[PDB]
Amino acid sequence: MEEKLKKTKIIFVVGGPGSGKGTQCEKIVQKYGYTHLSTGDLLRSEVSSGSARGKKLSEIMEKGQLVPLETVLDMLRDAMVAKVNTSKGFLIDGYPWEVQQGEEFERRIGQPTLLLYVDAGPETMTQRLLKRGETSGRVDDNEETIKKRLETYYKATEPVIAFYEKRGIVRKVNAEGSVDSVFSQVCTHLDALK
Numbered sequence: 001m002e003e004k005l006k007k008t009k010i011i012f013v014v015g016g017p018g019s020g021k022g023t024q025c026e027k028i029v030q031k032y033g034y035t036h037l038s039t040g041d042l043l044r045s046e047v048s049s050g051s052a053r054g055k056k057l058s059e060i061m062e063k064g065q066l067v068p069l070e071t072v073l074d075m076l077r078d079a080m081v082a083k084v085n086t087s088k089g090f091l092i093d094g095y096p097w098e099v100q101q102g103e104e105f106e107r108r109i110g111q112p113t114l115l116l117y118v119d120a121g122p123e124t125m126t127q128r129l130l131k132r133g134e135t136s137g138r139v140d141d142n143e144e145t146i147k148k149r150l151e152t153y154y155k156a157t158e159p160v161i162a163f164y165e166k167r168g169i170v171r172k173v174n175a176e177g178s179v180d181s182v183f184s185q186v187c188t189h190l191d192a193l194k
Contacts, residue, residue, distance in 0.1 A: 001077050001078065001080070001081035001084075002077060002109065002110045004080070004081055004084035004085060005077060005080050005081070005084055005109050005110045005111060006110045006111050007084070008080065008084040008087060008088070008089060008090070008111075009088065009089035009090075009111070009113035009114070009193055010076075010080065010089060010090060010092065010109055010111060010112050010113050010114075011034055011089050011090060011091050011092060011113060011114045011115075011116065011189075011190065011193065012091070012092035012093070012095070012114070012115045012116055013025040013028055013034070013036075013091040013092065013093050013116045013118075013186060013189075013190075014092065014093045014094055014095040014116060014117070014118060015116065015117045015118020015119060015120065015172070015173060015175060016117075016118060016119065016120050016121050016125055016150065016153060016157070016175070017125065017129075017153075018120065018121070018124070018125030018126075018128040018129040018132070018140070018146070019118040019119065019120030019121065019124060019125055019128070019175035019182060020118060020120060020124070020128065020175045020179060020182045021093060021116075021118035021173075021175065021182075021186075022093055023179055023182065023183070024118075024173070024179065024182055024183040024186035024187075025091055025093045025186070027183065027186075028091055028186060028187070028190055029091065031187065031190075032088065032089075032190060032194075033087065033088070034087065034088070034089050034090050034091040034190065035079070035080065035082075035083040035087045035089075035090035035091060036091050036093065037076075037079035037080075037090060037091060037092060037093070038092070038093045038094030039067055039072045039075065039076060039079075039092065039093075039094050039095060039096045039097075040061055040067050040094045041094070042071070042072070042075035042076070042078065042079055043057050043061070043067060043068055043071055043072075043075060044057075044061055046071075046075065053068070053071075066097055067094075067096070067097065069096065069097045069098075072096035072097060073096065073104065073105055073107070073108030073109060074108055076092060076096065076105070076108065076109055077108050077109045077110075079092070080109065089113060089114075089193065098156065098157075098160065099160045099163065099164070100159065100160060100163070102163075112169070113193045114169060114170075114171065114189055114190070114192060114193035115161075115164050115169055115170040115171070115189075116170070116171055116172075116173060116186060116189040116190075117157070117161045117170055117171070117172040117173065118172075118173045118175040118182055118186070119172040119173055119174050119175055119176060120174075120175030120176050120177075120182065121146075121147070121150035121153065121176075122147050122150055122151075122176075123176045123177070124175055124176050124177060125146055125150055125175075126143050126144075126146035126147055126150070127143065129141065129142070129143070129146050130143050171185075171188060171189030171192055172185075173185035173186045173188070173189065
């Protein structure tokens with residue numbers, strides 16, 4: 001795993017819920033071929049056997065809560081190996097949990113190359129969460145409050161992205177609009193490590 005990882009580049013294609021990260025994420029695989037792997041589906045697909053621990057994360061993933069912070073990396077190291085052999089690099093969508101430190105992800109995988117943040121929310125996620133929420137009769141339908149749900153999102157990820165912006169490694173995409181508004185950028189980050 002790692003031996004290949006150290007040799008391969010890691011990429012994280014993700015951002016804010018309702019921005020449209022995933023929309024481009026796979027489109028990336030379509031463009032360069034970065035392995036599309038979410039830190040969630042890793043345990044979601046692992047719950048089969050992993051069902052031992054699956055007890056909690058199984059519902060969390062359904063709860064929208066936080067995914068295992070301990071497994072995300074070991075699994076992230078698990079998500080790359082199966083492709084590193086043929087993958088120049090790989091995509092990490094869904095995001096692990098939280099940084100605010102740095103020394104953790106690379107501590108398992110071994111080498112972080114690029115980090116993407118699909119920046120939407122005040123303008124977009126508010127307008128997006130609706131069609132996905134309201135048509136379903138959800139709460140995300142808070143097109144008025146979504147700004148604040150996104151505001152509170154700042155205190156969480158915002159101090160992180162910027163933190164990575166200091167190193168100039170993270171690249172926030174502008175999902176503040178349509179697919180192309182978010183996509184012309186998703187590739188900027190992908191072409192930045194290239």
